[PDB]
Amino acid sequence: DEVX
Amino acid sequence: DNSYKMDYPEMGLCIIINNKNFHKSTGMTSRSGTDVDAANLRETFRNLKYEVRNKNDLTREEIVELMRDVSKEDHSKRSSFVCVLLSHGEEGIIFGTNGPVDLKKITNFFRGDRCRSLTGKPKLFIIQACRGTEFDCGIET
Amino acid sequence: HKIPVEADFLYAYSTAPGYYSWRNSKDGSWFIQSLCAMLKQYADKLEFMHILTRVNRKVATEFESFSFDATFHAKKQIPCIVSMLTKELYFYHHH
């Protein structure tokens, strides 16, 4: 999970 | 008169802008997994009979150019228009590979008075991008 | 005899104003994963807003971030449907  | 007319010869275009790699200055890391999104979207809208056009890693200048050109096409035989943006973003902003573009600048090309062949037809913009840096910590249920 | 120039637009945002949006490196973004899934399952019947509402529930209930960095761990997300549409939208037609 990574952030935009 | 409660439902949009969707029986034109074509359902319409589905423009997908898939930005994965950005310039260092933006400090944005590679958007791992976005290609999965692009492929998923392509198949999903193909099934709905949309004319899908995928574009990868566009600069902010190229995004504006693409949008302008698309809005200038004759959409008379198209029931609707779909645009999917996959990139980094900020509130009201979407990122080209080299910098920010205001979402308003992009959507304005399709205004009812600037794209007459789409007047009265649904114009959908699907935006996968950040709108700030706030976390939603949720609440137990 | 005229309609607003801003009418007939639908902005399906992956997240609420001011918030991060999540993307899984292997499975894709939470929002797009859910959007495509709901479209595939309900586009032949449900009106678009109702499909998007199910997308909202899917992202809200079936996803929670997992990260070795405690700062980005156990986070949630809710999409944001913004509609200036004037009619119901179905991705099919009754011949």
Side-chain angles (χ1 to χ4, degrees), chain B residues 89-107:
Chain B
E90 289 169 26
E91 183 59 44
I93 296 174
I94 192 62
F95 272 76
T97 58
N98 61 339
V101 195
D102 293 321
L103 278 173
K104 197 67 183 175
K105 183 172 180 58
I106 287 174
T107 59

Side-chain angles (χ1 to χ4, degrees), chain B residues 119-133:
Chain B
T119 303
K121 302 177 180 177
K123 296 166 269 296
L124 320 186
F125 293 79
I126 300 169
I127 310 156
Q128 171 46 50
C130 286
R131 301 181 70 181
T133 58

Side-chain angles (χ1 to χ4, degrees), chain B residues 1-7 11 28-34 36-38 40-41 44-45 48 50 80 82 84 86 91 103-104 107-108 110-113 119-139, chain C residues 3-33 35-37 39-40 43-44 48 71-72 74-78 80 82 84-93:
Chain B
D1 183 63
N2 302 305
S3 296
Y4 282 113
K5 180 179 186 297
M6 299 296 288
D7 66 334
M11 281 297 273
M28 178 64 200
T29 57
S30 185
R31 297 186 60 257
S32 301
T34 193
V36 175
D37 277 0
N40 201 353
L41 285 164
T44 298
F45 281 93
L48 297 176
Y50 278 81
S80 62
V82 177
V84 185
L86 312 179
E91 183 59 44
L103 278 173
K104 197 67 183 175
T107 59
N108 275 349
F110 301 88
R111 269 170 48 168
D113 66 319
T119 303
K121 302 177 180 177
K123 296 166 269 296
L124 320 186
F125 293 79
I126 300 169
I127 310 156
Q128 171 46 50
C130 286
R131 301 181 70 181
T133 58
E134 289 180 54
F135 286 114
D136 188 313
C137 295
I139 178 62
Chain C
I3 59 170
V5 303
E6 295 282 1
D8 303 310
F9 275 89
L10 180 292
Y11 312 85
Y13 290 99
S14 70
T15 193
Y19 290 81
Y20 279 121
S21 183
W22 293 87
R23 164 176 45 69
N24 182 277
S25 63
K26 178 182 67 175
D27 315 321
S29 64
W30 299 356
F31 181 61
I32 298 303
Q33 286 181 239
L35 176 56
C36 291
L39 279 172
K40 181 183 181 178
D44 62 14
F48 197 37
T71 300
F72 293 77
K75 307 308 180 186
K76 302 286 292 181
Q77 180 180 319
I78 184 68
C80 178
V82 181
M84 279 74 144
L85 297 182
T86 61
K87 299 181 183 176
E88 285 166 25
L89 178 60
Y90 298 93
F91 297 100
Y92 60 75
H93 177 284

